[PDB]
Amino acid sequence: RFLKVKNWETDVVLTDTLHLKSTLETGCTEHICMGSIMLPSQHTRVRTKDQLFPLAKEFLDQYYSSIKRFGSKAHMDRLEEVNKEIESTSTYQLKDTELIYGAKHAWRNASRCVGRIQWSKLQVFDARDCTTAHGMFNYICNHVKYATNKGNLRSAITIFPQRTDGKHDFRVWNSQLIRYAGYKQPDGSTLGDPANVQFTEICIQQGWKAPRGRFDVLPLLLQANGNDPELFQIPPELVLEVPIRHPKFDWFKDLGLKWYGLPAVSNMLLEIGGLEFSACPFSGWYMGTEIGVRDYCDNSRYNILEEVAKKMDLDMRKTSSLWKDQALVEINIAVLYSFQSDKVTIVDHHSATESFIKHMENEYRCRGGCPADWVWIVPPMSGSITPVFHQEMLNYRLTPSFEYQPDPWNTHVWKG
Amino acid sequence: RFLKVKNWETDVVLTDTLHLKSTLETGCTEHICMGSIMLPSQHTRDVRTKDQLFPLAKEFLDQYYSSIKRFGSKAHMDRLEEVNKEIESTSTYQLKDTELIYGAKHAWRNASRCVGRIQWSKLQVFDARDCTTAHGMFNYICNHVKYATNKGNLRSAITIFPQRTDGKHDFRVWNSQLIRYAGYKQPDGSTLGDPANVQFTEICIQQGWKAPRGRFDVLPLLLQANGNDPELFQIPPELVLEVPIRHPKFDWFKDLGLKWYGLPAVSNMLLEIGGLEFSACPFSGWYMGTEIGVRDYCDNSRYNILEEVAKKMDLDMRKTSSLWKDQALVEINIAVLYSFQSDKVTIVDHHSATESFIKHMENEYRCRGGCPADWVWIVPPMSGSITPVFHQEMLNYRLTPSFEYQPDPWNTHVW
Ligand code: HEM
Ligand code: HEM
Numbered sequence: 001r002f003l004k005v006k007n008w009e010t011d012v013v014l015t016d017t018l019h020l021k022s023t024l025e026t027g028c029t030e031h032i033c034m035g036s037i038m039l040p041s042q043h044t045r046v047r048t049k050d051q052l053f054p055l056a057k058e059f060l061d062q063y064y065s066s067i068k069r070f071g072s073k074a075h076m077d078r079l080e081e082v083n084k085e086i087e088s089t090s091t092y093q094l095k096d097t098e099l100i101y102g103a104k105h106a107w108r109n110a111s112r113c114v115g116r117i118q119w120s121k122l123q124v125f126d127a128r129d130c131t132t133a134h135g136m137f138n139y140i141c142n143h144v145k146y147a148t149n150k151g152n153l154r155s156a157i158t159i160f161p162q163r164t165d166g167k168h169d170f171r172v173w174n175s176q177l178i179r180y181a182g183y184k185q186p187d188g189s190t191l192g193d194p195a196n197v198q199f200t201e202i203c204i205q206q207g208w209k210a211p212r213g214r215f216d217v218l219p220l221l222l223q224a225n226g227n228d229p230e231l232f233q234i235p236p237e238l239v240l241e242v243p244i245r246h247p248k249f250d251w252f253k254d255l256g257l258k259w260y261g262l263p264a265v266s267n268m269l270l271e272i273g274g275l276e277f278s279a280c281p282f283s284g285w286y287m288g289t290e291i292g293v294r295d296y297c298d299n300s301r302y303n304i305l306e307e308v309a310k311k312m313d314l315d316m317r318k319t320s321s322l323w324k325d326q327a328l329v330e331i332n333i334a335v336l337y338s339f340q341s342d343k344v345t346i347v348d349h350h351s352a353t354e355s356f357i358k359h360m361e362n363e364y365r366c367r368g369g370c371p372a373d374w375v376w377i378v379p380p381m382s383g384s385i386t387p388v389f390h391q392e393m394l395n396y397r398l399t400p401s402f403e404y405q406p407d408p409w410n411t412h413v414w415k416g
Numbered sequence: 417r418f419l420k421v422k423n424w425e426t427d428v429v430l431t432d433t434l435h436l437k438s439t440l441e442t443g444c445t446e447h448i449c450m451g452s453i454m455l456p457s458q459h460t461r462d463v464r465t466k467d468q469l470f471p472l473a474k475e476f477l478d479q480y481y482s483s484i485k486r487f488g489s490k491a492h493m494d495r496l497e498e499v500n501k502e503i504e505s506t507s508t509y510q511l512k513d514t515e516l517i518y519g520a521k522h523a524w525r526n527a528s529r530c531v532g533r534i535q536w537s538k539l540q541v542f543d544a545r546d547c548t549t550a551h552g553m554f555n556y557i558c559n560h561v562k563y564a565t566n567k568g569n570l571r572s573a574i575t576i577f578p579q580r581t582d583g584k585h586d587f588r589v590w591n592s593q594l595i596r597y598a599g600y601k602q603p604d605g606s607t608l609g610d611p612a613n614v615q616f617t618e619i620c621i622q623q624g625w626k627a628p629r630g631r632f633d634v635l636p637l638l639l640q641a642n643g644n645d646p647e648l649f650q651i652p653p654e655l656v657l658e659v660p661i662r663h664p665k666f667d668w669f670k671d672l673g674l675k676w677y678g679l680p681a682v683s684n685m686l687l688e689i690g691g692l693e694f695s696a697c698p699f700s701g702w703y704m705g706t707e708i709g710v711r712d713y714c715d716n717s718r719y720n721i722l723e724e725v726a727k728k729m730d731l732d733m734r735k736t737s738s739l740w741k742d743q744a745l746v747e748i749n750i751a752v753l754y755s756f757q758s759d760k761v762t763i764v765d766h767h768s769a770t771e772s773f774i775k776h777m778e779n780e781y782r783c784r785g786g787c788p789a790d791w792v793w794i795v796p797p798m799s800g801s802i803t804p805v806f807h808q809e810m811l812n813y814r815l816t817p818s819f820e821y822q823p824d825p826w827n828t829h830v831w
């Protein structure tokens with residue numbers, strides 16, 4: 001059975017057969033659509049031999065298909081090897097080549113990611129020999145240096161040892177490797193990034209001496225083998241930052257703003273053939289709107305729309321003057337201008353969505369489909385003047401995948 | 417099974433029990449979400465046999481009599497058997513006036529893609545079920561337009577023409593909206609006017625109309641009654657309220673020679689109440705600013721004026737990363753709102769309307785147990801994340817009475 005999606009701006013129709021290879025669940029039913037639920041039960045993540053060999057077998061069939069060796073002796077011996085390894089140890093180990101394929105395909109299968117045109121070029125760093133938090137810090141420093149590359153950003157992922165019994169998890173407690181602190185003042189206001197207030201407090205309680213500035217890079221909080229997490233400060237020479245100025249508005253620099261160059265997600269779970277890699281930091285480069293729209297202008301974030309509009313001397317009395325819309329565009333112009341001027345890799349939302357449509361059509365041609373989550377692929381500003389807005393998209397879950405997991409401070413059993 | 421939606425700006429959590437009363441289907445399964453498909457088969461609508469018709473009536477009458485706190489009462493059971501008897505004999509049935517009004521209001525209440533539903537109970541229902549000819553349809557539609565326009569003080573309205581019988585005597589308004597601008601192919605291949613209406617504009621000519629071939633020519637009405645060939649009628653221009661578009665800061669904006677009509681009046685949908693199908697049911701309210709400025713003016717496959725506006729703003733149109741499209745987009749939408757407001761024609765900006773919708777959701781969850789809502793359509797086509805609906809989880813499910821899509825009649829008419 002086949003399915004069709006249509007682009008209502010260009011009338012291009014594509015045919016999806018890939019959804020037939022879908023295993024996980026969306027959360028929807030015939031009678032309700034959960035398409036706009038942030039964390040459906042099925043996108044989040046303690047696993048036994050009963051269900052593990054079929055998950056391994058399915059992954060290995062995919063793997064040997066991709067290398068044009070399905071049904072080979074290499075394929076069958078690998079299955080036997082994994083079979084024997086599971087029933088004898090209740091888990092198994094991925095070969096290097098399998099891990100690389102798996103991580104690339106978890107990105108390829110991330111239906112909420114607009115940047116997937118680049119999926120085949122992920123640099124995979126195997127840190128499965130890591131045993132301590134100090135070792136984790138070292139791998140992460142090397143990741144940040146490699147990915148940053150003096151502003152010429154490169155996609156990378158570092159993969160720490162997989163889950164075993166759930167009591168020896170590796171976890172990076174930060175949501176991103178590089179993020180600014182948030183401090184709730186007694187008067188109710190917030191200094192810094194309001195999204196990071198809870199994590200900042202854990203850091204301070206774990207012993208972090210906080211500078212209490214508006215743009216303090218948080219320390220790494222790293223958990224190895226289920227032990228209590230430990231604090232580490234990233235060397236500042238490794239944290240590339242960009243001061244934000246505007247090409248026409250000279251007062252913009254006086255707003256005191258800056259952002260870091262490297263977006264590096266560190267709290268997701270990487271699932272490959274049933275194995276769970278609970279610490280797998282990955283990084284790429286920013287789409288301008290992620291900073292200029294969400295980070296700066298979300299009411300629940302830095303929320304600088306007011307002061308930018310103030311300095312632009314906009315009619316702020318009534319919403320119908322669209323002062324919020326006007327200032328939002330200016331802020332995003334400045335983010336793109338600052339990054340490009342410092343030769344730090346960045347992509348605007350017009351270029352990124354255009355690339356994603358090309359990627360998506362190619363994936364239909366050569367793969368039979370491309371799972372995609374319209375709610376997340378459409379940019380948070382200027383939606384209908386980008387080509388993804390008019391693009392029908394089929395959302396379904398393929399593995400390998402990145403999954404959400406609970407925040408570790410809510411589940412950790414403290415040693416003391 | 418009693419589902420919850422969270423707003424990630426406010427942490428407000430609502431509990432949805434209304435979805436359990438859902439009858440129709442979403443297009444999705446547990447293996448694939450079709451939440452971004454424009455028209456899944458379920459959202460479109462051939463005989464309705466005597467069988468499935470009475471359950472559909474009972475369900476509707478049950479919620480109707482519940483809403484007036486007379487569920488399981490004298491009048492309720494009498495109406496049930498009355499409709500039961502009329503279906504048993506005539507193979508259809510006729511709604512009381514009160515049930516028609518309730519049905520129309522609730523089809524709007526249940527339109528999960530409509531951001532404007534906070535106003536749902538104020539709908540003015542015009543019963544046109546006594547209409548028999550296109551000239552009579554024209555009369556009802558002129559009265560609708562005049563009532564809804566109200567010299568700029570727009571009022572919500574729907575006019576309900578006779579329900580489908582055997583599918584051969586169908587009432588249809590062939591226009592997609594009562595008021596739309598013509599669109600013309602050019603010798604050099606471009607397009608004058610509105611490209612979405614190029615085919616319809618040619619049907620009108622290729623069947624009688626003589627086009628003035630301007631850039632904003634109001635289309636004639638093409639009205640089909642009882643299944644006959646449709647007939648052309650011109651809406652009296654004095655009934656068509658238009659707004660010239662100028663900018664509050666840029667004097668040159670006036671020179672662009674833009675205008676738009678004040679009355680959004682959708683005329684090609686199907687209204688379903690208690691199993692009965694109302695194939696001609698034009699309804700109208702008032703615009704949200706971005707419908708004109710973002711989609712009508714700046715869609716590539718529409719008027720597509722971004723280029724010209726940015727040129728007159730002397731923006732660096734060399735690279736996409738100058739965000740010249742975004743900057744021009746905001747100015748256009750400022751102009752639309754400023755023009756409408758200056759001319760005292762009702763309009764709402766996307767900040768006000770999405771805020772109204774959150775309040776509406778609050779109200780529906782409090783007094784009804786939920787509110788079906790389609791995030792893909794509710795979030796405005798610009799400035800999405802600086803509006804509260806962007807951060808609002810919404811559950812999408814299909815309740816009846818409802819508005820549904822139907823085929824374009826010229827693909828179907830026994831000509
Ligand atoms: C290289 C440039 C990249 C760009 C421009 C990009 C852009 C984006 C954007 C805009 C989102 C939407 C989430 C949000 O706006 O908060 C997203 C989501 C996501 N990205 Fe990418 N991304 C890139 C690279 C990567 C890489 C290297 C990976 C993993 C190897 C990745 C995995 C994901 C995943 C899993 C999500 C979905 C998160 C979820 O399901 O909630 N991305 N990306
Ligand atoms: C009074 C002010 C109103 C406003 C501001 C408003 C706004 C909107 C908007 C912005 C949409 C999205 C569709 C698009 O972007 O083209 C929509 C959809 C819709 N509106 Fe409303 N509307 C209003 C009144 C009404 C009324 C009076 C009715 C019927 C009684 C109605 C029925 C619908 C339906 C059925 C849809 C969705 C069609 C579908 O399912 O695809 N609306 N509305």
Ligand SMILES: CCO[C@@H]1C[C@H](CCc2cc(F)c(F)c(CCc3cc(C)cc(N)n3)c2)N(C)C1
Pocket residue numbers: 038039115263264265268282283284285286287290
């Ligand atoms: C617990 C609730 O979480 C909710 C969900 C949402 C999480 C947002 C999010 C989660 C991810 F996993 C992720 F990868 C990205 C993409 C960021 C990114 C990554 C890379 C590599 C490049 C690039 N350009 N951008 C964003 N957050 C607002 C609150």
Ligand SMILES: CCO[C@@H]1C[C@H](CCc2cc(F)c(F)c(CCc3cc(C)cc(N)n3)c2)N(C)C1
Pocket residue numbers: 454532680681682685699700701702703704707
């Ligand atoms: C044939 C292709 O179909 C695709 C689908 C899509 C459908 C467009 C559409 C269909 C509706 F039913 C509807 F109600 C509206 C809302 C417009 C409206 C109505 C009122 C009363 C007030 C107001 N402010 N706005 C829009 N259209 C772009 C092309």
Ligand SMILES: C[C@H](O)[C@H](O)[C@H]1CNc2nc(N)[nH]c(=O)c2N1
Pocket residue numbers: 008389390391392393452453454792793794
């Ligand atoms: C393919 C996609 O569903 C299509 O572009 C939808 C997206 N959301 C929309 N939202 C509104 N309000 N109006 C539309 O026409 C659309 N079009």
Ligand SMILES: C[C@H](O)[C@H](O)[C@H]1CNc2nc(N)[nH]c(=O)c2N1
Pocket residue numbers: 036037038375376377378424806807808809810
């Ligand atoms: C409720 C809703 O699902 C939530 O706000 C989503 C909407 N779409 C999004 N899209 C992107 N790219 N990033 C987001 O965080 C969100 N948030």
Ligand SMILES: [Zn+2]
Pocket residue numbers: 028032033034035444448449450451
């Ligand atoms: Zn769905």
